[PDB]
Design an enzyme around this catalytic site. Structure first.
Site, PDB file in Angstrom:
ATOM      1  N   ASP A 193     106.337  24.153 -37.704  1.00 23.26           N
ATOM      2  CA  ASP A 193     106.575  22.830 -37.147  1.00 23.26           C
ATOM      3  C   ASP A 193     108.061  22.552 -37.266  1.00 23.26           C
ATOM      4  O   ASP A 193     108.822  23.347 -37.834  1.00 23.26           O
ATOM      5  CB  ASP A 193     105.688  21.724 -37.808  1.00 23.26           C
ATOM      6  CG  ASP A 193     106.059  21.333 -39.252  1.00 23.26           C
ATOM      7  OD1 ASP A 193     107.186  21.514 -39.728  1.00 23.26           O
ATOM      8  OD2 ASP A 193     105.163  20.733 -39.914  1.00 23.26           O
ATOM      9  N   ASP A 195     110.806  19.338 -38.098  1.00 17.24           N
ATOM     10  CA  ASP A 195     110.919  18.048 -38.778  1.00 17.24           C
ATOM     11  C   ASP A 195     112.251  17.392 -38.442  1.00 17.24           C
ATOM     12  O   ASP A 195     113.307  18.013 -38.601  1.00 17.24           O
ATOM     13  CB  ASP A 195     110.794  18.231 -40.293  1.00 17.24           C
ATOM     14  CG  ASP A 195     109.509  18.956 -40.673  1.00 17.24           C
ATOM     15  OD1 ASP A 195     108.464  18.339 -40.444  1.00 17.24           O
ATOM     16  OD2 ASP A 195     109.513  20.127 -41.130  1.00 17.24           O
ATOM     17  N   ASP A 250     107.407  16.580 -36.256  1.00 19.60           N
ATOM     18  CA  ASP A 250     107.314  15.374 -37.072  1.00 19.60           C
ATOM     19  C   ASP A 250     108.585  14.560 -36.908  1.00 19.60           C
ATOM     20  O   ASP A 250     109.692  15.097 -37.017  1.00 19.60           O
ATOM     21  CB  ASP A 250     107.061  15.687 -38.547  1.00 19.60           C
ATOM     22  CG  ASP A 250     105.718  16.350 -38.774  1.00 19.60           C
ATOM     23  OD1 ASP A 250     105.581  17.141 -39.716  1.00 19.60           O
ATOM     24  OD2 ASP A 250     104.793  16.092 -37.984  1.00 19.60           O
TER      25      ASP A 250
HETATM   26 MG   LIG Z   1     108.166  21.615 -41.589  1.00 23.34          MG
HETATM   27 MG   LIG Z   2     103.316  21.654 -43.978  1.00 21.31          MG
HETATM   28 NA    NA Z   3     106.435  18.844 -40.608  1.00 23.26          NA
END
Ligand SMILES: [Mg+2]
Ligand SMILES: [Mg+2]
Ligand code: NA
Ligand SMILES: [Cl-]
Ligand code: NA
Length: 326
Positions: A193, A195, A250
């Site tokens: 992911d 961030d 995120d």
């Molecule tokens: Mg991350």
């Molecule tokens: Mg995580």
């Molecule tokens: Na994240």
DNA sequence: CGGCATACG
DNA sequence: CGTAT
DNA sequence: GCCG
């Protein structure tokens, strides 16, 4: 070797990769069984090995290292002697471990949900798709996008996403800034992911920002899933040659007064932050979170202008993000 | 033995 | 319950 | 599971 991970540099790559990976299997398995204390010890023992300056070749080199007792030492001993640890291999091939790993990797599914499904006899992703009445909207999105979300995110992907987030942030609030955090700020070349931390130099101007950002990203057709606040856990549509792929992103907003604390928290690693907060409270009597650092005796918050400020106020030598890979 | 980080959606 | 470092 |  100090006992807290926040007291020692931990680089992203190191000299005990196989040993640390084995201990982290046992940590993960402990979490699947709800044994949070054992998870923490195995994580800590793995992290000690990551901080060492050369390979462990003999069992005597574990003497005096923190978080190595009878169990973690036996695991290392077996790997040194035979190249494999029977307990670790038994976990790896177990139906329970493999299924809990598969299910908890789904966005929207945690240990408790995965365990309930396991006890009900479910074992595969297609088992879950067969009974969609049992799934939340979040879980449905996690299952639909599971294959893409299992594919590593690369640094080139991150640069592309940051530009589109900056564009939307600039229309939502001119002057607002976007900082890459998480594992990519610690130097990872791949991740699962991305961030981002958003603020504005004028205290208070960031209020109400994240809805305006999300609405603009959704109007650009870039949001495959979001919950609609100050944190957003999204699935983005990322362009690819002749196609695209789903990526977890995120987005977090903080006021500039709290930005150093939020940056420190969201840069991680997870274990580094747990250890830092444990150190703060137990060794310094101060209460640390992603908003601030509280003195519960004087009942005051410590104003920080930088991450360097926070390390100084805790009496810790500064560690750059690349050395927080506990 | 107690403790194990701390928050938001 | 889920999410995050 | 390990520490203090
Ligand atoms: Mg991350
Ligand atoms: Mg995580
Ligand atoms: Na994240
Ligand atoms: Cl927090
Ligand atoms: Na999950």
């Amino acid at each position: 070797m100090p006992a807290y991970a926040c007291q020692r540099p931990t680089p992203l790559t190191h000299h005990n990769t196989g040993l640390s990976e084995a201990l982290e299997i046992l940590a993960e398995a402990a979490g699947f069984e709800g044994s949070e204390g054992r998870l923490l010890t195995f994580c800590r023992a793995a992290s000690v090995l990551k901080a060492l300056p050369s390979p462990v070749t003999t069992l005597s080199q574990l003497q005096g290292l923190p978080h190595f007792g009878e169990h973690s030492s036996r695991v290392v001993q077996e790997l040194l002697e035979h190249g494999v640890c029977e307990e670790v291999e038994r976990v790896r091939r177990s139906e329970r471990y493999q299924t809990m790993k598969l299910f908890t990797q789904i966005f929207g599914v945690g240990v408790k949900t995965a365990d309930r499904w396991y006890r009900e006899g479910l074992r595969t992703l297609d088992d879950l798709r067969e009974q969609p009445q049992k799934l939340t909207q979040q879980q449905k999105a996690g299952l639909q996008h599971h294959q893409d979300l299992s594919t590593p995110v690369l640094r080139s992907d991150v640069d592309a996403l940051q530009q589109v987030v900056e564009e939307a942030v600039g229309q939502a609030l001119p002057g607002a800034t976007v900082t890459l955090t998480g594992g990519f700020r610690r130097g990872k070349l791949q991740g699962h992911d991305v961030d981002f931390l958003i603020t504005h130099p004028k205290e208070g101007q960031e209020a109400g920002l994240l809805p305006r950002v999300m609405c603009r990203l959704q109007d650009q057709g870039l949001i495959l899933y979001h919950q609609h606040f100050e944190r957003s856990f999204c699935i983005f549509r990322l362009p690819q040659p002749g196609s695209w792929k789903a990526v977890r992103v995120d987005l977090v907003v903080a006021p500039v007064s709290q930005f150093p604390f939020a940056l420190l928290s969201w840069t991680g690693s997870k274990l580094f932050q747990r250890e830092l907060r444990r150190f703060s409270r137990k060794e310094k009597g101060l209460w640390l979170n992603s908003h601030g650092l509280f003195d519960p005796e004087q009942k005051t918050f410590f104003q920080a202008a930088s991450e360097e400020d926070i390390f100084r106020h805790l009496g810790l030598e500064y560690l750059p993000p690349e050395q927080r890979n506990a």
